[PDB]
Design a binder for this molecule. Structure first.
Ligand code: 47Z
Ligand code: 47Z
Ligand code: 47Z
Ligand code: 47Z
Ligand code: 47Z
Ligand code: 47Z
Ligand code: CL
Ligand code: CL
Ligand code: MN
Ligand code: MN
Ligand code: MN
Ligand code: MN
Ligand code: MN
Ligand code: MN
Ligand code: MN
Ligand code: MN
Ligand code: MN
Ligand code: MN
Ligand code: MN
Ligand code: MN
Lengths: 190, 190, 190, 190, 190, 190
């Protein structure tokens, strides 16, 4: 079994992650940042992980610290769950069309952090996705992928080929990471 | 079983489609537009569909009306055959090299029409592929992919990375759509 | 003697080639594509080959498949006829002026496919030469030279220095290939 | 079984290839060019081939002749091992992230040579990878992929999306070719 | 008979050339610079010369002095062997395709040194061809052709039309010079 | 025998041409324009023609009328001497290096006038070559080649690849035409 439980308590946040790589998309995410909840639920579900995330942090400041602590904890869990990485596909990639948006992610697990994020339209460096709760600043997308890659110790390449809507651009990237991971972690029959 | 029979009779054309998603590439296409017959035969065959298409239309005008009515009928059949889309991979993509040409298609079935067509060389907006019968104006390629996507209610992204020969560029795109669909419709074991 | 007979039967076409390198320009070509017949007759004749080509293919679609299958079969015949390539000039080149057009070809037989096609005016990527029969799309010129080179296993460099008329540009290139081959295949007295 | 043994003895080199497409990555390569040994070992291993390569050539001149003769022999072996290509996926592609580098390869086996190599940074046309033995001039990468494609009679498209380190750029391309081939040669269950 | 033996002993090198213009390509070259050995062997052989070159020089410094002294000695031998140049074609030219590379040389013997070298890609001014022995700096190509022309007292025009690989670009130029010389030195029957 | 005698008497000039295509370069030219005498002597001699030209014209005006009448008469003689053009090479080309200058000419005899003149440096449109007699305005070079081609009824393509000295540029073009004609008129043994 490829399960990990990570507890991460900092001055800024309190995180619990329970991750199973060999899941059916049983996913529950509650961080206090509802758009981030949606993105991590999409990630767990499209990866066919079982994933629970419970995070409380300093959202009076903004989402950044909670988002980052969550991504660090989640990456740590992914790395621990992967163990020796013996017998897995190792390489994975996925294209995700979302209406006008096309995103792609490619991964190499096998143990050296690296993240390359390209093609995200420049308006996403100062876009806010806002509802009735704590908002999500899309400039953080890159930071989430970097933190994941750095703590899981994997190579993660995330690309936006084109798109316009910041919700479509963001969600397609999270889904692309998710399906790339799904393919990479699967047993390689050879 | 994931089969559909569509009959579409308009002022301009008369179409019958019999489609099975779970096929072995048993394909017979007769539209009166032989290059289109070739492209739809390539599509059915590379998708591992069973597909029969019988169309008669107003080819004295040109192929456009028959091509469009056929693509609408075929997309309708694909949507009906997909039913609830329960348990399928949903996402699919395929690269197709054809000598100098590289084409790509990515699909998301799961229920909102969208089509993005990019990178086709500009000479394909006024190219004719002509033999001894009704010719095929390559400007129609985009129209075929749009009509398919709109009537199957799927997201279809078709890209030409590079190429020169209009037959290679056209056929690689039809084949790319076909293999992307093949992957997307397949049962997802998870 | 440097003779080869190639029969090539595909789903798309039926080809018979009889080639003698040591000929007097006794040439008969019938492919169902009369401008291609003219170009291959010019090639056989200006190479001082004896050449018969009988091809029937799917010209209801367009000339492409028949043209390509013919060029593959012809290149195969050229390679077989050349045998060990012992004692031949190996290198050949020819300039062909045709009114306003100047074309050139250079060849190296001795056994590694390579084709470089340069300087053809851009209007030839979407030009049609049309008469009362199956038309010829000049974009195919490059494809013919590539298929020949790849199946004869020779280096073929075809250049258009300048020109305007697509018939002159096309015919001068076929003639240039023909005279370059003629020189390359001839016994080298040293 | 899909095995081939090729012996190729030229004025410049002496090659023996034993190739099994249906392997477990049992790979032994010795050419006298240790970086090339590494690249061909990566290729055999990531393709899940069993592969032995023993080559001795004129490395006093430089690696080029031995590298080229090896790639020709290896491509010949791949083509022979593939036989009729009945029942295989035929199409394959793979993305390979290697730290900062992202490379891609796409293949079509089914029987016409073609190679398109794009996006390799210009500094790789005059880069040397040098250790204590015979060095490797990265300008040869393109030549290796061309020779492989031409002798296996396949379409091979190799792309560098981006990268900096010439070892990462080179190794990611060899690995991408390897995983694309792996997917293409696998039995297609349909 | 058109034979010359040149001995050239300098502070830097020791050269012996035996040249016969009316040869069969009986060629033996040993300079201590194996890529140069290969280029001069190609030159002698493609010119249908009989040629022996034995050179020892200061290769601890680099190949330059030995290469230059050899080219001077060889040019001197070519000039002496040509004698009165009575009854020869005088003018010669040759195109040499080498995979992606096309090179050309044109010569006028009849008695005034001149060398024009054009079209060599700029990367060849700082490229090294390196094996297990003394390497070859391609910037020297021009110097070799200049030294040959100046000491044989001939006009030599060497052109690279296009190419990429520095070994193909260099070898095609040496072969082009060789076949141009072959044609120029041959008896003119008129 | 391929001989012609042309007498051309106009208001401006009096011309006699005796031409033998199958000559040994027995050439005598006297037009009253000594640089033109030199160019036509070079042409006759390098073509291996036997050629006598006696022209007297209105050189008080300038050389133009005499030069043009001579070129018309000479072209007429070349056409008449060629007769049916049965059994000849038909195509000919020649490169001529002259110190810094490289010129080329290509010819097709077989019966439709055409002349393309390219690459002559712009300073040759207003250059004078002057001695102690009637001078030669190099702008006339093009006119001479046009008049020759038009009256012999041949395709003549003359190119200057590069050069500086107007005497070298002019003389290399006349010599290139001469050697191209020599090759084209020779019996083709096939
Ligand atoms: C100690 C951490 C929470 C710091 N204030 C921070 N803000 C944004 N990124 N980081 C590291
Ligand atoms: C009613 C239809 C056949 C119409 N003339 C048309 N031409 C091209 N596209 N459409 C919709
Ligand atoms: C199987 C062949 C005939 C294919 N449809 C094609 N069209 C154009 N080139 N090719 C290979
Ligand atoms: C005969 C071969 C070994 C030739 N010298 C060469 N060098 C580089 N490529 N090639 C074909
Ligand atoms: C005396 C010679 C050998 C001199 N050092 C030199 N190096 C490179 N070219 N030259 C002439
Ligand atoms: C009648 C002729 C001699 C006329 N003046 C002329 N000058 C230059 N070219 N031409 C035709
Ligand atoms: Cl891509
Ligand atoms: Cl040229
Ligand atoms: Mn941070
Ligand atoms: Mn959403
Ligand atoms: Mn329409
Ligand atoms: Mn086709
Ligand atoms: Mn084709
Ligand atoms: Mn014609
Ligand atoms: Mn090579
Ligand atoms: Mn490595
Ligand atoms: Mn020097
Ligand atoms: Mn070589
Ligand atoms: Mn005039
Ligand atoms: Mn002179």
């Amino acid at each position: 079994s490829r399960r990990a439980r990570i507890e991460r308590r900092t001055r800024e946040s309190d995180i619990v992650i329970e991750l199973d790589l060999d899941g059916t998309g049983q996913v529950a995410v509650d961080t206090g940042v509802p758009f981030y909840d949606h993105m991590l639920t999409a990630l767990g579900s499209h990866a066919s992980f079982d994933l629970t995330v419970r995070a409380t942090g300093d959202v009076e400041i903004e989402a950044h610290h909670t988002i980052e602590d969550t991504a660090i904890a989640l990456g740590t869990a992914l790395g621990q769950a992967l163990g020796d990485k013996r017998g897995i596909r190792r390489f994975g990639d996925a294209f995700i069309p979302m209406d006008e948006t096309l995103a792609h992610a490619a991964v190499d697990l096998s143990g050296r952090p690296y993240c390359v994020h390209t093609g995200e339209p420049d308006h996403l460096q100062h876009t806010t996705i806002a509802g009735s709760s704590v908002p999500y600043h899309t400039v953080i997308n890159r930071h989430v992928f970097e933190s994941l890659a750095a703590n899981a110790r994997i190579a993660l390449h995330v690309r936006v080929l084109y798109g316009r809507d910041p919700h479509h651009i963001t969600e397609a990237q999270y889904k692309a990471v998710a399906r790339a991971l799904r393919q990479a972690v699967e047993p390689d029959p050879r």
